[PDB]
C-alpha cells in the first residue's frame, strides 16, 4: 500500500490541503479567517498543524503581514501629501502591491500547483520584493530628496539585480519630474509645487535696506542642493537665466520679448 | 500520534537592523520537545520488520523536513542551536530507538540539511553591505543555486517518491541524491564557506601584529593596506582561484565553479574597464584595488589597496604592471578634469579597449597585459598630444 | 665593472638623498573611512535593547 | 553602560540556557 | 570516480531488484548478479594494490589486462586507460 495510508493514523487530526489553501488565500487577501485570527500582529496558529507545515505557513503569514503593512503605509502616504517624486514612488509601491495581489489571485484561481514547497519557491521573488519595499518604507517617511537620490544611486551600484532595478525605476521617475521642474524654472521662472526640492528660491525678508526691491534682486541660490550629475557651473547658469528673466519681466517691462 | 495542545503564536519581529535585508523577519515555531504538537511514537514498535516500512516512511518524511530545513518527529534540534540567534551552530539529534541503518542515513541527511541551513545563514549575513558587493553577489548566487537546483530536485524527486511511489527505499533515495550530485556540490560549497570562515578567523585574530620605485616615480601614490574582518573583492577572487586550482579531476565542478566566479566578478571586470578607459573611480564597497584622495590642493594621492588586489604585486614585472595601470588611470582622470568632460569618448584616439568578460581567462592569459599596454599607450598619446598642442 | 658600478651607485645615492629631502613623496596610510547608506544603515542603536526586551519576553515564555 | 547592560543580558541568556 | 560509479551502479541494480521482486529463486538471483559479483571481485583485487603502484605500473597493468583473454577485465582496462590518457 501507499505510505499515505500508513501516515494517516498520525495525522488524522490535520487540516486538508484544500482548506489550507482556501484559508491562506484569505490571510493573504486580508479577509477575516476563522482558523487563523489574522489581526495586526497575532495570527494564533492552532496546534494541530505539523511543525514543518507550521513554519511554512508562518513564512507565508509573514509575507502576508508585510504586504498588509505595505498597503497601510501606501494608504497613509496617499492620504498625506509629499513632494511629487515621492508621491510617484508611493504610486509605484502601490502598483507593486496590486501586482502581488493579482499574482496571488491568479495562483488561487488556477490551483495547478499542488506542493506548498513549490508555491513558496515560486513566490519567493515577490516575498523578497515586498521585504525590500517594507524595508524602504520603514525610513521613507524620514528621508529627504537628496538622501533618497543618494540611496537610489547606492542601490543602483549595489550588486543585487532586483534592488538595482527598483532603484533605477525610482531614480528615473524622480529625475523625470526633476527635469520637468528645471524646465519650468528655466522657461517661465516658476517655483510652484517645489516642496523644497529645488536649489533656487526667493528670499523676501529684508533687513531695512531696499525694502521694495529696487536693486535687491531677492533671488537666492543654494550650492549643495544639486545632485552629482549636474555641474555647479550649469546650476549657476540656470540661476542667472531665471534671475535675468525675472529682471526683464519686472523692471524692464519687456513683456513681449520675455513671452 | 496524540495531538497535544500547546500555544503556537507567530508575530512580526519589528527588529530588522541587525538582521540583513535578506534575513529572517518572523519568530520560529515551537519545537517538538518544547511545545509538543504530536505525541512521539515509540520507534522500537516500528523497528520490527513488519512495521519497518512504516518506520522508513516516517524517517524519510523527517529527513525531507531536515532537507528543507525544518525539524522532524524523531529528529530534532540540538542544544547548541537556538532559533533566536543566527550565529548559533546548527546540529540535530536523532532518537536512539531508531535502527542504526536509518540512524546513519538520517545522520547523512542531517549533515546535508545542516550544511544547507549554514549556507543559508551565510548568504543571509553576506547580503549586508559590510561584506562588500562582491560577497553580496556571491551570496545571491548561492541563494539562486539553492533555490533553482537543490530544493527543486528535492520537490521533484524525493517528495514524489515518498508520496506516489510504492516499494521505495531510503537507500534508493540516497542513490538518487548521489545521481543528482547536488550533495557533492553542497559539500564543496560548505568546504568553501569553511575556508572563508577560517580566513575570517585568522584576519580577526591578527590584531596586534598587523620600495624605492614609488620614490623614483614622480607620482603622488601610496599604499593603503587596511585589512577587513572579512575578505572582500580581490581577496574572495584569490580564494576562489585557489579553490579552483586545488579542485583536480572534477572538470564539471571546475566548470560550474568558473561560471559562478564569472557571474560574481562580472562587476569587477566592468570596474577595471572603467578605471582603465576613463580613470573614473567608483568604489562604494572598498573593493577596487586603487582609490584616490579628495573624494596638494590640486595633486591628490592615489592609494593602492593590497587587501583587495588581484595579484601579489611582489615581482618587478607585477609592480611595473600595477604602476602602469595606475598611471593610465591618473592620466585619464587628469585629462577628464582638464577638458571638463565626464567621460573620454573612444573617438578621441585610434585605440579601442574591449570590456573584460572572463576574469579567469584574463588572469591566465596575456590579454590582460595586452589591454593594459593598449590603454596605457592610448592615455600617454592623448596626454602628449594635449600638452603639446594646447 | 667596479668603475661603472660605483658611478651608478653614487648617482643612485645622490638621487635617493635628494628625493628623501624633497618632501618624501613615498608614503603609506591606513583607511579610516567607510560609506554610509542611510536606507540600510542603522538609524539608532536602541534596537539592540529592543531585541534585548524581545529575548527577555522569550525567556519568560520559556520559563512558563 | 550600554555594553555592561548587554553583558548582563548575556548573563541572563546563559542562565536561561542552563535552565533549558 | 569510475570505481565509485560501478559501486553505485551495482547499488542501484540491487535496489531495483529489491523494489521489483520479480526474482523468485535465489539460484536465479545469484546467476543474474554473478556478473556484478565478478566485477566487484576484480575491482577489490585492483584496489588491493592500487595504493602501492605508480602511474607507469598502472598503465602497464592496464595494457596487460587489455591483452588478457577475458572480456570484462579488458573492457575495464580500456576504460581506465582512456581516462588516464
User: What is the stated resolution of the deposited model, in angstroms?
Assistant: 9.2
C-beta separation of A174 from A85 below 8 A: yes
C-beta separation of B281 from B292 below 8 A: yes
Give the residue carrying C-alpha cell 500508513: A6
Q: What are the CA-CA distances from residue B269 to residues B272, B359, B363, B373, C53 (Å)?
A: 5, 7, 11, 17, 46
Q: How far is the C-alpha of E66 from the C-alpha of E60, rounded, in Å?
A: 10
Q: Is B187 helix (H, G, I), strand (E, B) or coil?
A: helix
User: What residues pair up with C29 in beta bridges, in sequence order?
Assistant: B224
Q: Is B221 helix (H, G, I), strand (E, B) or coil?
A: strand
Give A69's contacts (C-beta < 8 A, 6+ positions apart).
Answer: A134, A137, B12
CA trace torsion A105, A107, A109, A110 (10° rounding)? 160
Cβ contact, residue pair C37, A154, below 8 Å: yes
Q: Which residues of A touch B151 (CB under 8 A)?
A: 117, 121
Residues 145-204 on B with a CB inside 8 Å of A are: 147, 151-152, 154-155, 159, 162-164, 166, 168
Q: Look at residues A25, A10, A118 and name the one whose alpha carbon lies nearest to residue A64.
A: A25
Give E23's contacts (C-beta < 8 A, 6+ positions apart).
Answer: E17, E29, E32
Cβ contact, residue pair B8, A128, below 8 Å: no
Give the side-chain half-sphere CA count within 13 A for A108.
Answer: 18
Cβ count near E9 (within 10 Å)? 13
Which residue in C has a C-alpha nearest to residue D16's C-alpha? C59
Query: Can you state the angle between helices A84-110 and A116-140, rounded to 10 degrees?
Result: 170
C-beta separation of B220 from B301 below 8 A: yes
The single-letter DSSP state of residue A226 is S
Q: Is C28 helix (H, G, I), strand (E, B) or coil?
A: strand
Q: Which helix (H) or strand (E) holds B386?
A: helix B367-389
PDB experimental method: cryo-EM
Q: Which helix (H) or strand (E) holds B223?
A: strand B221-224
C-beta separation of B10 from A52 below 8 A: no
C-beta separation of B374 from B288 below 8 A: no
**Residue E9 has which C-alpha cell?**
551502479
Q: Which helix (H) or strand (E) holds B75?
A: strand B75-77
Closest Cα in chain A, distance from residue B134 (Å)? 7
Q: How far is the C-alpha of B331 from the C-alpha of B379, rounded, in Å?
A: 6
Q: How far is the C-alpha of B229 from the C-alpha of B131, rounded, in Å?
A: 9
Task: Compute the residue count for chain A.
Answer: 259
CA trace torsion C50, C56, C57, C58 (10° rounding)? 110
Task: Compute the residue count for chain C.
Answer: 64
Cβ contact, residue pair D16, C63, below 8 Å: yes
Cβ count near B4 (within 10 Å)? 14
For chain B, report the end-to-end CA distance as a whole number of angstroms: 90
The single-letter DSSP state of residue C43 is S
Q: How far is the C-alpha of C37 from the C-alpha of C20, rounded, in Å?
A: 41
Q: How far is the C-alpha of C39 from the C-alpha of B103, rounded, in Å?
A: 48
Torsion sign across C-alpha atoms B173, B156, A2, A55: positive
Q: Which residues of D touch C (CB under 8 A)?
A: 2, 5-6, 9, 12-13, 16, 19-20
* Any A CB within 8 A of C37 CB: yes
C-beta separation of A199 from A240 below 8 A: no
Residues 135-174 on A with a CB inside 8 Å of B are: 135, 138, 154, 157-161, 163
Q: Is B292 helix (H, G, I), strand (E, B) or coil?
A: strand
Q: Which residues of C touch B (CB under 8 A)?
A: 15-16, 19-20, 24-32, 34-35, 37, 40, 42-43, 47-48, 50-51, 54-55, 58, 62
Q: In this structure, what are the phi and psi dihedrals at residue B149, rounded to the nearest 5 degrees?
A: -125, -60
Cβ contact, residue pair B220, C25, below 8 Å: yes
Q: Which of B214, B286, B303 sits opposite C26 (nearest CB)?
A: B214
Q: How far is the C-alpha of B191 from the C-alpha of B115, rounded, in Å?
A: 9
* Any E CB within 8 A of B270 CB: no
Q: String of b and e for A37-56 (b: at least 16 CB within 10 Å)?
A: ebeeeebebebbbbbbbbbb
C-beta separation of A48 from A14 below 8 A: yes
Cβ contact, residue pair A3, B57, below 8 Å: yes
Q: Which of B15, B129, B284 sits opposite C47 (nearest CB)?
A: B15
Q: How far is the C-alpha of A67 from the C-alpha of A133, rounded, in Å?
A: 9
Q: How far is the C-alpha of A78 from the C-alpha of B16, rounded, in Å?
A: 25
> What stretches of chain A show up as alpha helix (H) in DSSP?
3-7, 17-28, 51-79, 84-110, 116-140, 145-157, 162-188, 232-250, 255-258
Closest Cα in chain E, distance from residue B366 (Å)? 29
Q: Is A45 helix (H, G, I), strand (E, B) or coil?
A: strand
The single-letter DSSP state of residue B224 is E
Residues 44-73 on E with a CB inside 8 Å of B are: none
* Strand B221-224, strand B302-304: pairing: parallel
Q: Look at residues B238, B244, B213, B242 and name the one whose alpha carbon lies nearest to residue B320.
A: B213
Q: Look at residues E66, E62, E51, E64 and name the one whose alpha carbon lies nearest to residue E85.
A: E62
Q: How far is the C-alpha of B281 from the C-alpha of B277, rounded, in Å?
A: 11
**Residue A112 has which C-alpha cell?**
495547478
Angle (CA) B286-B287-B291 rounded to 5° is 60
* Strand B290-292, strand B302-304: pairing: antiparallel
Q: How far is the C-alpha of A148 from the C-alpha of A154, rounded, in Å?
A: 10
Closest Cα in chain B, distance from residue E48 (Å)? 22
Residues 97-116 on A with a CB inside 8 Å of B are: 115
For chain C, report the end-to-end CA distance as a whole number of angstroms: 90
Cβ count near E8 (within 10 Å)? 15
**Residue B86 has which C-alpha cell?**
543566527
In the 3-class helix/strand/coil scheme, how is B5-69 assigned residue by residue? Answer: CCCECCCECCCCCCCCCCCCCECCCCCCCCCCCECCCCHHHHCCCCCHHHHHHHHHHHHHHHHHC
Radius of gyration of chain D (CA): 9
Query: Can you state the angle between helices B100-126 and B182-205, rounded to 10 degrees?
Result: 50
Amino acid at each position: 500500500v501507499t505510505l499515505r495510508q500508513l501516515s494517516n493514523p498520525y495525522y488524522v487530526n490535520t487540516i486538508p490541503e484544500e482548506d489550507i489553501l482556501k484559508y491562506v488565500s484569505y490571510t493573504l487577501l486580508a479577509t477575516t479567517s476563522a482558523l487563523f485570527p489574522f489581526d495586526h500582529e497575532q495570527i494564533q496558529i492552532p496546534s494541530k498543524i505539523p511543525n514543518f507545515e507550521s513554519g511554512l505557513l508562518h513564512l507565508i503569514f509573514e509575507a502576508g503581514l508585510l504586504y498588509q503593512s505595505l498597503g497601510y503605509k501606501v494608504e497613509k502616504f496617499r492620504m498625506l501629501n509629499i513632494s511629487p517624486m515621492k508621491k510617484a514612488l508611493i504610486i509605484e509601491i502601490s502598483e507593486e502591491l496590486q501586482n502581488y495581489t493579482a499574482f496571488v489571485n491568479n495562483l488561487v484561481s488556477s490551483g495547478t500547483v499542488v506542493s506548498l514547497k513549490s508555491l513558496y519557491r515560486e513566490i519567493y521573488e515577490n516575498i523578497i520584493r515586498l521585504r525590500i519595499y517594507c524595508r524602504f518604507t520603514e525610513h521613507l517617511e524620514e528621508l529627504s530628496g537628496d538622501t533618497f537620490l543618494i540611496e537610489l544611486n547606492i542601490f543602483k551600484s549595489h550588486g543585487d539585480l532586483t534592488i538595482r532595478k527598483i532603484a533605477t525605476n525610482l531614480f528615473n521617475s524622480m529625475i523625470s519630474l526633476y527635469y520637468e521642474y528645471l524646465m519650468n524654472w528655466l522657461t517661465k521662472g516658476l517655483l510652484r509645487a517645489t516642496y523644497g526640492e529645488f536649489f533656487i528660491a526667493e528670499n523676501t525678508d529684508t533687513n531695512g535696506t531696499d525694502d521694495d526691491f529696487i536693486y535687491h534682486i531677492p533671488i537666492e541660490f543654494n550650492q549643495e542642493r544639486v545632485p552629482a550629475f549636474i555641474p555647479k557651473e550649469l546650476a549657476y547658469k540656470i540661476f542667472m537665466i531665471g534671475k535675468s528673466y525675472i529682471f526683464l519681466e519686472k523692471y524692464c517691462k519687456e513683456v513681449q520679448w520675455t513671452n | 500520534m496524540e495531538i497535544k495542545e500547546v500555544d503556537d503564536r507567530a508575530e512580526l519581529l519589528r527588529y530588522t537592523n541587525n538582521i540583513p535585508l535578506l534575513g529572517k523577519l518572523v519568530n520560529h515555531q515551537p519545537l517538538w520537545s518544547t511545545n509538543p504538537k504530536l505525541k512521539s511514537f515509540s520507534l522500537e514498535k516500528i523497528s520490527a520488520p513488519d512495521q519497518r516500512r512504516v518506520q522508513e516512511a516516517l524517517v524519510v518524511k523527517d529527513l525531507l523536513n531536515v532537507l528543507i530545513g525544518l525539524e522532524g518527529t524523531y529528529i530534532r534540534y540540538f542544544n547548541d542551536y537556538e532559533p533566536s540567534d543566527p550565529e548559533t551552530p546548527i546540529e540535530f539529534k536523532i532518537a536512539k530507538k531508531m535502527d542504526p541503518s536509518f540512524k546513519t542515513f538520517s545522520r547523512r541527511i542531517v549533515r546535508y540539511g545542516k550544511q544547507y541551513m549554514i549556507l543559508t545563514r551565510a548568504y543571509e549575513k553576506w547580503s549586508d553591505t559590510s561584506f562588500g558587493m562582491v560577497l553580496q553577489r556571491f551570496a545571491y548566487e548561492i541563494r539562486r543555486f539553492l533555490e533553482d537546483v537543490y530544493l527543486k530536485t528535492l520537490v521533484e524527486r524525493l517528495e514524489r517518491d515518498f508520496n506516489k511511489v510504492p516499494n521505495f527505499s531510503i537507500r534508493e533515495l540516497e542513490q538518487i541524491i548521489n545521481e543528482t550530485e547536488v550533495n557533492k556540490q553542497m559539500e564543496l560549497l560548505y568546504n568553501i564557506y569553511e575556508e572563508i570562515f577560517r580566513e575570517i578567523e585568522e584576519r580577526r585574530t591578527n590584531q596586534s601584529s598587523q620600495n624605492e620605485s614609488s620614490l623614483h616615480l614622480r607620482l603622488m601614490v601610496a599604499f593603503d593596506t587596511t585589512v577587513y574582518p572579512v575578505p572582500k573583492g580581490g581577496a574572495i577572487l584569490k580564494i576562489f582561484q585557489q579553490k579552483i586550482l586545488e579542485n583536480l579531476g572534477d572538470r564539471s565542478s571546475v566548470m560550474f565553479l568558473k561560471k559562478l566566479l564569472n557571474n560574481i566578478s562580472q562587476d569587477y571586470c566592468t570596474m577595471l574597464y572603467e578605471w582603465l578607459t576613463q580613470g573614473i573611480l567608483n568604489d562604494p564597497y572598498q573593493e577596487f584595488m586603487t582609490y584616490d584622495d579628495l573624494e596638494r590642493a590640486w595633486d591628490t594621492q592615489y592609494f593602492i589597496r593590497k587587501d583587495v588586489l588581484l595579484r601579489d604585486c611582489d615581482s618587478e614585472e607585477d609592480k611595473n604592471l600595477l604602476f602602469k595601470m595606475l598611471r593610465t588611470g591618473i592620466l585619464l582622470k587628469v585629462v577628464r578634469a582638464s577638458l571638463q568632460i565626464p567621460t573620454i569618448p573612444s573617438n578621441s584616439s585610434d585605440i579601442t579597449i574591449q570590456e573584460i568578460n572572463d576574469f579567469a581567462d584574463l588572469m591566465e592569459g596575456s590579454n590582460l597585459e595586452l589591454y593594459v599596454d593598449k590603454c596605457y599607450s592610448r592615455a600617454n598619446e592623448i596626454f602628449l598630444k594635449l600638452f603639446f598642442q594646447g | 665593472e667596479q668603475e661603472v658600478r660605483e658611478h651608478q651607485m653614487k648617482k643612485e645615492r645622490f638621487d635617493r638623498a635628494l628625493e628623501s629631502k624633497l618632501l618624501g613623496k613615498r608614503h603609506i596610510t591606513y583607511a579610516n573611512s567607510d560609506i554610509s547608506n542611510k536606507e540600510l544603515y542603522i538609524n539608532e542603536i536602541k534596537s539592540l535593547k529592543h531585541e534585548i526586551k524581545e529575548l527577555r519576553k522569550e525567556k519568560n515564555d520559556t520559563l512558563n
